[PDB]
Protein backbone atom coordinates (compact mmCIF):
# COMPACT_ATOMS: atom_id res chain seq x y z
CA UNK A 1 0.00 0.00 0.00
CA UNK A 2 2.94 2.79 0.31
CA UNK A 3 2.74 4.75 -2.86
CA UNK A 4 5.94 7.56 -3.41
CA UNK A 5 4.11 10.43 -4.86
CA UNK A 6 6.65 12.66 -6.77
CA UNK A 7 6.25 16.28 -5.54
CA UNK A 8 8.14 19.84 -6.70
CA UNK A 9 9.87 19.60 -3.54
CA UNK A 10 11.08 15.63 -4.06
CA UNK A 11 9.49 12.18 -3.71
CA UNK A 12 7.61 11.14 -0.63
CA UNK A 13 6.35 8.14 0.31
CA UNK A 14 2.53 7.49 2.28
CA UNK A 15 -0.21 5.41 2.46
CA UNK A 16 -3.23 6.61 0.91
CA UNK A 17 -6.52 5.23 2.86
CA UNK A 18 -9.75 5.63 3.31
CA UNK A 19 -12.84 7.90 2.41
CA UNK A 20 -14.31 10.88 2.96
CA UNK A 21 -12.70 14.68 4.00
CA UNK A 22 -9.10 14.36 3.82
CA UNK A 23 -6.85 14.71 7.05
CA UNK A 24 -2.93 14.31 6.27
CA UNK A 25 -1.39 12.37 9.06
CA UNK A 26 1.95 13.27 10.30
CA UNK A 27 3.90 10.88 12.62
CA UNK A 28 6.15 11.39 15.73
CA UNK A 29 10.47 10.38 16.18
CA UNK A 30 11.05 8.05 15.34
CA UNK A 31 7.88 6.99 13.19
CA UNK A 32 6.86 6.22 9.91
CA UNK A 33 3.56 5.00 8.02
CA UNK A 34 2.97 2.23 10.38
CA UNK A 35 2.61 4.60 13.24
CA UNK A 36 0.42 7.10 10.85
CA UNK A 37 -1.78 4.25 10.17
CA UNK A 38 -1.89 3.40 13.94
CA UNK A 39 -2.86 7.31 14.41
CA UNK A 40 -5.39 7.43 11.64
CA UNK A 41 -7.65 4.43 12.20
CA UNK A 42 -10.33 6.63 14.10
CA UNK A 43 -10.44 8.60 11.22
CA UNK A 44 -11.60 6.12 8.77
CA UNK A 45 -13.67 4.74 11.03
CA UNK A 46 -15.45 7.88 11.31
CA UNK A 47 -15.40 8.82 7.63
CA UNK A 48 -12.61 10.72 6.74
CA UNK A 49 -9.43 9.71 4.69
CA UNK A 50 -5.95 10.06 5.42
CA UNK A 51 -2.70 10.98 3.72
CA UNK A 52 -0.41 9.15 5.90
CA UNK A 53 3.07 10.44 5.03
CA UNK A 54 6.57 8.72 5.61
CA UNK A 55 8.47 12.04 7.12
CA UNK A 56 12.12 12.62 5.30
CA UNK A 57 14.74 10.07 6.66
CA UNK A 58 12.18 7.53 7.41
CA UNK A 59 11.47 4.60 5.13
CA UNK A 60 11.38 5.53 1.73
CA UNK A 61 11.22 9.47 1.95
CA UNK A 62 14.67 10.43 0.92
CA UNK A 63 16.00 13.09 3.58
CA UNK A 64 16.48 15.57 0.70
CA UNK A 65 12.87 15.94 0.45
CA UNK A 66 12.81 18.18 3.57
CA UNK A 67 15.43 18.14 6.68
CA UNK A 68 14.03 21.05 8.26
CA UNK A 69 10.47 21.76 9.98
CA UNK A 70 10.14 24.30 7.54
CA UNK A 71 11.06 22.28 4.86
CA UNK A 72 8.75 19.64 5.51
CA UNK A 73 5.80 21.42 5.95
CA UNK A 74 6.85 22.88 1.90
CA UNK A 75 7.04 19.54 0.95
CA UNK A 76 3.22 18.62 2.82
CA UNK A 77 1.76 21.46 0.09
CA UNK A 78 3.97 20.27 -2.35
CA UNK A 79 2.24 16.64 -1.77
CA UNK A 80 -1.26 18.11 -1.63
CA UNK A 81 -0.37 19.97 -4.96
CA UNK A 82 0.50 16.49 -6.32
CA UNK A 83 -2.74 14.66 -5.47
CA UNK A 84 -4.07 18.29 -6.72
CA UNK A 85 -5.76 18.69 -3.29
CA UNK A 86 -6.40 22.40 -2.45
CA UNK A 87 -6.42 21.67 1.42
CA UNK A 88 -6.76 19.10 4.05
CA UNK A 89 -7.18 18.47 7.83
CA UNK A 90 -3.89 17.72 9.79
CA UNK A 91 -3.53 15.33 12.56
CA UNK A 92 -0.03 15.64 14.20
CA UNK A 93 1.35 14.28 17.34
CA UNK A 94 4.87 14.54 19.13
CA UNK A 95 7.19 15.16 17.08
CA UNK A 96 4.85 15.57 14.00
CA UNK A 97 4.56 18.91 15.59
CA UNK A 98 6.93 20.87 14.22
CA UNK A 99 6.33 20.84 10.17
CA UNK A 100 3.04 20.58 10.83
CA UNK A 101 2.92 23.65 12.76
CA UNK A 102 4.71 25.38 9.94
CA UNK A 103 2.58 24.19 7.35
CA UNK A 104 -0.46 26.07 9.57
CA UNK A 105 1.44 28.75 10.07
CA UNK A 106 3.01 29.39 6.61
CA UNK A 107 0.06 27.77 4.58
CA UNK A 108 -2.94 28.61 5.90
CA UNK A 109 -4.92 28.33 3.25
CA UNK A 110 -3.80 24.55 2.67
CA UNK A 111 -5.04 23.39 6.37
CA UNK A 112 -8.94 23.46 7.27
CA UNK A 113 -8.08 22.25 10.76
CA UNK A 114 -5.29 21.36 13.26
CA UNK A 115 -6.00 18.47 15.65
CA UNK A 116 -2.52 18.50 17.01
CA UNK A 117 -1.92 15.89 19.81
CA UNK A 118 1.27 16.43 22.65
CA UNK A 119 3.13 17.90 19.81
CA UNK A 120 6.70 19.62 19.98
CA UNK A 121 5.70 22.92 19.62
CA UNK A 122 8.91 24.94 20.28
CA UNK A 123 12.89 23.91 21.01
CA UNK A 124 13.03 20.55 22.23
CA UNK A 125 16.41 18.45 23.82
CA UNK A 126 16.42 14.78 23.75
CA UNK A 127 17.34 12.82 26.84
CA UNK A 128 19.41 10.33 25.64
CA UNK A 129 19.01 6.77 26.36
CA UNK A 130 21.37 4.44 28.21
CA UNK A 131 22.45 0.41 28.89
CA UNK A 132 19.37 -1.66 28.06
CA UNK A 133 16.95 1.10 26.42
CA UNK A 134 19.80 2.25 24.30
CA UNK A 135 20.26 -1.19 22.98
CA UNK A 136 16.36 -1.82 22.96
CA UNK A 137 15.42 0.73 20.89
CA UNK A 138 18.45 2.20 19.15
CA UNK A 139 19.64 -1.53 17.42
CA UNK A 140 18.04 -3.81 15.47
CA UNK A 141 18.08 -6.81 17.84
CA UNK A 142 16.11 -4.47 19.69
CA UNK A 143 13.35 -3.84 17.13
CA UNK A 144 13.23 -8.01 16.69
CA UNK A 145 12.71 -8.28 20.43
CA UNK A 146 10.21 -5.54 20.45
CA UNK A 147 8.36 -7.36 17.04
CA UNK A 148 8.57 -10.50 19.38
CA UNK A 149 7.50 -8.74 22.12
CA UNK A 150 4.30 -7.65 20.64
CA UNK A 151 3.54 -10.54 18.94
CA UNK A 152 3.87 -12.92 21.49
CA UNK A 153 3.89 -11.19 25.07
CA UNK A 154 1.44 -8.12 24.29
CA UNK A 155 0.57 -7.42 27.77
CA UNK A 156 4.31 -6.83 29.37
CA UNK A 157 5.23 -4.69 25.90
CA UNK A 158 1.59 -2.50 26.81
CA UNK A 159 2.85 -2.10 30.50
CA UNK A 160 6.53 -1.10 29.64
CA UNK A 161 5.26 1.25 27.25
CA UNK A 162 2.64 3.10 29.02
CA UNK A 163 4.94 3.01 32.01
CA UNK A 164 7.74 4.70 29.95
CA UNK A 165 6.01 7.02 28.28
CA UNK A 166 4.44 8.48 31.32
CA UNK A 167 5.07 9.98 35.38
CA UNK A 168 1.53 7.24 36.73
CA UNK A 169 2.46 5.20 39.47
CA UNK A 170 2.93 1.44 39.27
CA UNK A 171 -0.80 0.80 40.28
CA UNK A 172 -2.49 3.49 38.13
CA UNK A 173 -0.08 1.76 35.15
CA UNK A 174 -1.45 -1.59 35.62
CA UNK A 175 -5.17 0.10 35.87
CA UNK A 176 -4.54 1.53 32.40
CA UNK A 177 -3.27 -1.38 31.12
CA UNK A 178 -6.17 -3.61 32.12
CA UNK A 179 -8.44 -1.15 30.48
CA UNK A 180 -6.42 -1.65 27.00
CA UNK A 181 -6.06 -5.46 27.58
CA UNK A 182 -10.25 -4.89 27.16
CA UNK A 183 -9.84 -2.94 24.30
CA UNK A 184 -8.97 -4.51 21.16
CA UNK A 185 -8.15 -1.34 19.37
CA UNK A 186 -6.13 0.14 22.51
CA UNK A 187 -4.06 -3.25 22.52
CA UNK A 188 -3.54 -3.02 18.80
CA UNK A 189 -2.66 0.94 18.78
CA UNK A 190 0.11 0.16 21.52
CA UNK A 191 1.56 -2.67 20.01
CA UNK A 192 2.24 -0.95 16.86
CA UNK A 193 3.41 2.84 18.61
CA UNK A 194 5.79 0.27 20.35
CA UNK A 195 7.44 -1.57 17.81
CA UNK A 196 7.72 1.87 16.32
CA UNK A 197 9.44 3.98 18.60
CA UNK A 198 12.90 1.91 17.39
CA UNK A 199 14.68 4.46 15.49
CA UNK A 200 17.47 1.86 14.03
CA UNK A 201 17.86 0.88 10.75
CA UNK A 202 15.51 2.96 8.22
CA UNK A 203 13.97 5.04 10.88
CA UNK A 204 17.62 6.31 11.67
CA UNK A 205 17.96 9.02 8.98
CA UNK A 206 15.01 10.88 10.05
CA UNK A 207 15.38 10.42 13.98
CA UNK A 208 18.69 11.67 13.92
CA UNK A 209 18.07 14.50 11.93
CA UNK A 210 14.29 15.65 13.81
CA UNK A 211 16.72 15.38 17.49
CA UNK A 212 18.94 17.94 15.57
CA UNK A 213 16.12 19.84 14.03
CA UNK A 214 14.46 19.91 17.13
CA UNK A 215 17.41 21.46 19.32
CA UNK A 216 17.87 24.00 17.35
CA UNK A 217 13.81 25.50 16.88
CA UNK A 218 14.08 29.61 17.19
CA UNK A 219 10.38 29.93 16.86
CA UNK A 220 7.71 27.66 14.76
CA UNK A 221 5.34 31.23 14.95
CA UNK A 222 2.12 29.12 16.00
CA UNK A 223 0.89 32.90 16.85
CA UNK A 224 0.34 33.16 12.60
CA UNK A 225 -1.74 30.25 13.08
CA UNK A 226 -5.67 30.84 12.05
CA UNK A 227 -6.65 27.18 11.39
CA UNK A 228 -9.79 25.77 13.87
CA UNK A 229 -7.25 23.77 16.62
CA UNK A 230 -7.78 21.19 19.01
CA UNK A 231 -4.60 20.91 21.03
CA UNK A 232 -4.69 17.74 23.29
CA UNK A 233 -2.80 16.93 26.03
CA UNK A 234 -2.20 13.94 29.06
CA UNK A 235 -1.34 15.18 32.15
CA UNK A 236 1.08 12.60 33.03
CA UNK A 237 3.03 12.57 29.70
CA UNK A 238 6.67 12.34 30.52
CA UNK A 239 7.38 12.23 26.67
CA UNK A 240 6.08 15.45 25.48
CA UNK A 241 5.60 17.88 28.44
CA UNK A 242 2.29 19.51 28.68
CA UNK A 243 3.93 22.97 28.74
CA UNK A 244 4.18 22.80 25.20
CA UNK A 245 0.40 22.17 24.26
CA UNK A 246 -0.48 24.82 26.75
CA UNK A 247 2.18 26.79 24.77
CA UNK A 248 0.47 26.18 21.86
CA UNK A 249 -3.01 26.84 23.21
CA UNK A 250 -1.65 30.30 23.87
CA UNK A 251 -0.22 31.04 20.39
CA UNK A 252 -3.07 29.76 18.46
CA UNK A 253 -6.13 32.06 18.76
CA UNK A 254 -9.51 30.32 19.16
CA UNK A 255 -7.89 27.04 19.81
CA UNK A 256 -8.79 24.41 22.42
CA UNK A 257 -6.95 22.64 24.87
CA UNK A 258 -8.08 19.47 25.97
CA UNK A 259 -6.56 17.67 29.28
CA UNK A 260 -6.63 13.92 29.93
CA UNK A 261 -6.13 13.30 33.68
CA UNK A 262 -3.34 10.66 34.12
CA UNK A 263 -2.61 10.23 30.31
CA UNK A 264 0.30 9.23 29.15
CA UNK A 265 2.15 10.42 25.70
CA UNK A 266 -0.68 8.07 24.15
CA UNK A 267 -3.19 9.09 26.18
CA UNK A 268 -5.36 10.58 22.52
CA UNK A 269 -5.76 6.78 21.74
CA UNK A 270 -5.81 4.68 24.88
CA UNK A 271 -6.92 7.12 27.84
CA UNK A 272 -10.08 5.96 29.65
CA UNK A 273 -12.32 9.28 28.70
CA UNK A 274 -10.40 9.49 25.37
CA UNK A 275 -13.19 8.40 23.06
CA UNK A 276 -15.07 11.74 23.25
CA UNK A 277 -12.34 13.56 22.31
CA UNK A 278 -10.86 11.32 19.08
CA UNK A 279 -14.62 12.08 18.19
CA UNK A 280 -14.54 16.13 18.38
CA UNK A 281 -10.68 15.89 16.28
CA UNK A 282 -12.85 13.67 13.77
CA UNK A 283 -15.64 16.53 13.64
CA UNK A 284 -12.82 19.05 13.68
CA UNK A 285 -11.39 17.41 10.40
CA UNK A 286 -14.24 17.18 9.14
CA UNK A 287 -14.42 21.14 8.20
CA UNK A 288 -17.87 20.94 6.98
CA UNK A 289 -17.76 17.85 5.12
CL1 LIG B 1 -2.99 7.19 28.89
NA1 LIG C 1 7.14 6.28 34.05
Given at each position: ??????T??????????????????????????????????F????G??????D????????L??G??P???????????????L????????????????????????????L?????????????G?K????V???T?????????????????????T????????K?????????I????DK????????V?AN?????????D?????????D???????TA????????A?S??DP?????????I???????????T?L?????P??????????????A??
Amino acid sequence: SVQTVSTARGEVDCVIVGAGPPVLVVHGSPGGHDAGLAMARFLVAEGLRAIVVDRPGYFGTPLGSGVTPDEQAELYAALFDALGLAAAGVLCWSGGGPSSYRLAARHPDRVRALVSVAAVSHRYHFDGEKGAEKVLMGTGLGRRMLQLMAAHTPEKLVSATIAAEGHLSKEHVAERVAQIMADPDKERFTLELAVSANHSGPRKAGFDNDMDQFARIDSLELDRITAPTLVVSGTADSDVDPEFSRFAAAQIAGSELVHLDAGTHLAFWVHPDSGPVRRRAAELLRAGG
